């Protein structure tokens, strides 16, 4: 019997800062126990200061991104070159995903950028189109490895202030872009160690009011 779905592995990570946002993802592409590519870009600049990554079944991922990029183009045509806000992009993507409710896009999708007040924004989607704005989200193969670490090191969960013994929580101080990138690199380095589908390379897209910047880092190739 023909199975229309497949698993291309990979892992993605979105973090929302105070006035910035990052969307990272490894560059390894796989089937079963083989490597297809050590460098196959997974996070894309979709225009209007929005970055996107559809992780899971690569064919459905490429199709969704391609259709969203198209939706941005036609949004400009239809509404006098108006900038598509991150919240509007998120709602649009829900309807793209739910159009295939009974034959879904097999991907976990994340977009990142800035909201209309200039603050950092990350939105997270399931394969059938449920979505929500988040401060922090890991998606894909090693998502379960990374998220707990981010609960601890980004939202300071289970961390209290010394001397008080559980009475006073660690205050939720904001993180700089340099601090976030450190947590991203350590997350993927740790994921690479314990997850066979994670490795080769790490590509990070950083979004600020100035635009979209890229950073690349090597990961272990075994």
């Amino acid at each position: 019997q023909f199975n229309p779905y497949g698993d291309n592995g990979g892992t993605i990570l979105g973090i929302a800062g105070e006035d910035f946002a990052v969307l990272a993802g490894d560059t390894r592409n796989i089937t079963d126990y083989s490597i297809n590519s050590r460098y196959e870009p997974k996070v894309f600049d979709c225009g209007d200061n929005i970055v996107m990554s559809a992780n899971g079944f690569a064919a459905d991922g490429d199709a969704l991104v391609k259709r969203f990029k198209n939706s941005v183009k036609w949004y400009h045509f239809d509404h006098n070159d108006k900038k598509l806000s991150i919240n509007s992009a998120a709602r649009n993507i829900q309807h793209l995903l739910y159009s295939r409710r009974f034959f879904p896009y097999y991907v976990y999708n994340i977009i990142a950028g800035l909201d209309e007040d200039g603050k950092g924004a990350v939105y997270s989607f399931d394969p059938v189109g449920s979505y929500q704005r988040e401060q922090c989200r890991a998606g894909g193969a090693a998502a379960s490895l990374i998220m707990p670490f981010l609960d601890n090191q980004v939202n300071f969960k289970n961390q209290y202030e010394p001397g008080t013994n559980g009475k006073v929580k660690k205050p939720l101080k904001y993180l700089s872009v340099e601090e976030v990138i450190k947590l991203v690199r350590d997350s993927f380095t740790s994921a690479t160690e314990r997850h066979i589908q994670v490795g080769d390379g790490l590509e990070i897209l950083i979004v600020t009011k100035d635009g979209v910047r890229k950073e690349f880092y090597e990961l272990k190739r075994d």
Partner: protein, 226 residues
């Protein structure tokens, strides 16, 4: 898993990677797949890890008793025969896929054995999920009349092919050299091409960060006098 065996001029060498997995998760990054059946008979194992260790320890135990009974050094054909008859009896359910090698009074030997009990003879062999990547290297670079140095290089290169190209294999390369008229040299972590880079940050917490409810001394000592 990637394991290989290569014959050379005056002996035989075996090698293996050090990765163990359950699904897509790595359980052990530096696992030992090279086993000692007897001092100069070693085997590499792929498949179910508990099975490769258990079947190897059992036959190794019986080989030791046999050696004592006969006042002779153990032979590779004996270990081979005892392993295959044991595995055949369990009709493939004991998931041990082994490369058996060694030196004995008859000379140097190299065999493979599958879980259902079939054995094979060869100058170069490979087993495991990365056996295709390793065999590609072996088929490209192997030749008759290899030296000890050339064979170690070929064997480790074959393992590396598995490490880099097979997701079921990774981390380090273990080697064991069995030369005629010499002690077998077990080279644990012969290559270390996958050391983790320094982390960007230290995650050492301030003392008192974790909330505690109760403390108590655990009595590990025995009942005391007086």
């Amino acid at each position: 898993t990637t394991i290989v065996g290569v014959k050379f001029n005056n002996g035989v060498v075996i090698a293996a990677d050090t990765r163990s997995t359950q699904g897509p998760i790595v359980a052990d990054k530096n696992c030992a797949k090279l086993h000692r059946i007897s001092p100069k008979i070693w085997c590499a194992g792929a498949g179910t890890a508990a099975d490769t260790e258990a079947v190897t320890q059992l036959i190794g135990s019986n080989i030791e008793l046999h050696s004592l009974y006969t006042s002779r050094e153990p032979r590779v054909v004996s270990a081979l025969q005892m392993l295959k008859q044991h595995l055949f009896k369990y009709q493939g359910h004991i998931g041990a896929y082994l490369i058996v090698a060694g030196v004995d009074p008859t000379g140097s030997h190299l065999f493979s054995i599958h879980a259902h009990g079939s054995t094979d003879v060869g100058y170069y062999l490979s087993l495991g999920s990365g056996s295709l990547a390793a065999m590609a290297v072996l088929e490209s670079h192997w030749k008759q009349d290899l030296t000890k140095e050339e064979a170690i290089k070929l064997a480790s290169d074959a393992i590396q092919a598995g490490i880099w190209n097979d997701l079921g294999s990774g981390s380090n390369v273990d080697v064991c050299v069995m030369e005629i008229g010499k002690d077998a040299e077990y080279l644990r972590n012969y290559l270390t091409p996958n050391v983790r880079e320094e982390k960007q940050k230290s995650y050492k917490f301030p003392r008192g960060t974790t909330a505690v409810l109760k403390e108590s001394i655990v009595n590990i000592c025995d009942i005391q006098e007086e």
